[PDB]
């Protein structure tokens, strides 16, 4: 069980800084909203599931028994993003940001595109 | 004696992490807040607060839910520098579910304590992440839920006015309280959106990052199965608002318990007509 | 399943745009309060249920066990007001309009005649 911090988890996504026009303080705001930086956060619904810190959907992202039919795009199964490691939620949530974009998060344009100070690591 | 309380409490500490993963022991979060009197009673040693609050919640079997909310609630209003109270308004019976009339009885039972100036009604699942989000009324009516994760963080719509609002003694009484005639589920926040308007009041809220709320995921409940004349009975309030609400409640008070944490008043509202 | 958003419903109204008088956002705000944008919305009563985001009641307009006297309006099973197509969903709701007109759904007059600025999706 691992729940991040919001410094610790700053320096980890590092290599997102300056991703294609997106700012690591955005990016950070936005998961606080989203999981709260608990690698273990999941949200059930009818039909579909998120996982993890980056609350990945297995309607198309990744592979879970709920959704068979499933794209699986980052070619994986879901519940790996439960595991204290997020090396590989990481590359997954990597290509969400290519493919979807950043607005994936519904909470980045909704709360974290201004008064970024806060999530700010230094 | 005792100085007057600042505008801003110097102990805010901003977001917070919320989860409802773990267990809680009220026992324990009553030793976590010593402070904290007999019937959920806080008021400042350090400071005198202009904020009479009187913490209103409507509720039926979800002491679950309620465990959490006393849990996260009761630091940050000590934090907030309130001088507070918590009323949880419990619905005896089986019968439909009434949110808006739970809601006058708790203003009107509160009362009786003290002399409350502001109202906070809160639904019992839902809790601020962040303590700036100000739990005490303004000049204006406020709403605190103002974004919600159910909603993507976002206001579902601008005249809405569900989850948690903060209304003063004086705004309460000049929309005639709330309507009492909604049963089941949805509308009475929008009736009682239409109420203050009507009134030439206007909605006050605290800036979206701050107004953030998780809700505790729970399954839908028969005994407030959506209520199908909620959009007839909005359409209407403007000539509804004067014969339902505060002047026309009724109610039968069948217990009051003191708990440590909260004053639970268990009450029979009766029957839609 | 599916749920659609604002900006999602807005290009799949387009053919309704208008239709009785009716403008895009007017059904947007309109079927957000009726259904939330789902599909599979169901609401059922004593005696009748109301399906998908247009929330269409089997007492009248669709082919339901529940109701089976019930007079089909809409030549439809109930059923496919539950599947992530609104195709026919919308050819429900013009017949909807045309005999009672947008006071079907009740929501509109409470909530979809006054700041429809919202409902538009921004780009
Ligand atoms: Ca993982
Ligand atoms: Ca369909």
């Known amino acids: 069980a691992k729940q991040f911090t919001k410094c610790e988890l700053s320096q980890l996504l590092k290599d997102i800084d300056g991703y294609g026009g997106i700012a690591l303080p955005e990016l950070i705001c936005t998961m606080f909203h989203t999981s709260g930086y608990d690698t273990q956060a999941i949200v059930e619904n009818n039909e579909s599931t998120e996982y993890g810190l980056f609350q990945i959907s297995n309607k198309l992202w990744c592979k879970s028994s709920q959704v068979p039919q499933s794209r699986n795009i980052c070619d994986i199964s879901c519940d790996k993003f439960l595991d204290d490691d997020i090396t590989d939620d990481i590359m997954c949530a990597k290509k969400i940001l290519d493919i979807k974009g950043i607005d994936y998060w519904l909470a980045h344009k909704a709360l974290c595109t201004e008064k970024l100070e806060q999530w700010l690591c230094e | 004696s005792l100085p007057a309380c600042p505008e801003e409490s110097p102990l805010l500490v901003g977001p917070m992490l919320i989860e409802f993963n773990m267990p809680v022991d009220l026992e324990l979060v009553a030793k976590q807040n010593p402070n904290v009197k ?204 004067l014969s339902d609400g505060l002047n026309s409640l009724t109610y039968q008070v069948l217990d009051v318990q003191r708990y440590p944490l909260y004053t639970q008043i268990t009450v029979d509202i009766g029957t839609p007509s």
């Open chain 2, 38 to 241: 007999m019937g959920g009673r806080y008021a400042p040693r350090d400071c005198v607060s202009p904020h009479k609050v009187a913490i209103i919640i409507p509720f039926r079997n979800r002491q679950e839910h309620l465990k959490y909310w006393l849990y996260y609630l009761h630091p940050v209003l000590q934090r907030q520098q309130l001088d507070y109270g918590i009323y949880v308004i419990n619905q005896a019976g089986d019968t439909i579910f009434n949110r808006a009339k739970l809601l006058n009885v708790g203003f009107q039972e509160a009362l009786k304590d003290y002399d409350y100036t502001c109202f906070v009604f809160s639904d019992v699942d839902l809790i601020p992440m962040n303590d700036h989000n100000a739990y005490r009324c303004f000049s204006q009516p406020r709403h605190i839920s103002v974004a919600m994760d159910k909603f993507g963080f976002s206001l579902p719509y601008v005249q809405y006015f569900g989850g948690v609002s903060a209304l003063s003694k004086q705004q309460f009484l000049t929309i005639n309280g709330f309507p009492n005639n909604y049963w089941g589920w949805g509308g009475e926040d929008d009736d009682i959106f239409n109420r203050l308007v009507f009134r030439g009041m206007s909605i006050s809220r605290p800036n979206a990052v701050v107004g953030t709320t998780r809700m505790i995921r729970h399954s839908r409940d028969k005994k407030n199965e959506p209520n199908p004349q909620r959009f007839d009975r909005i359409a209407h309030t403007k000539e509804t608002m």
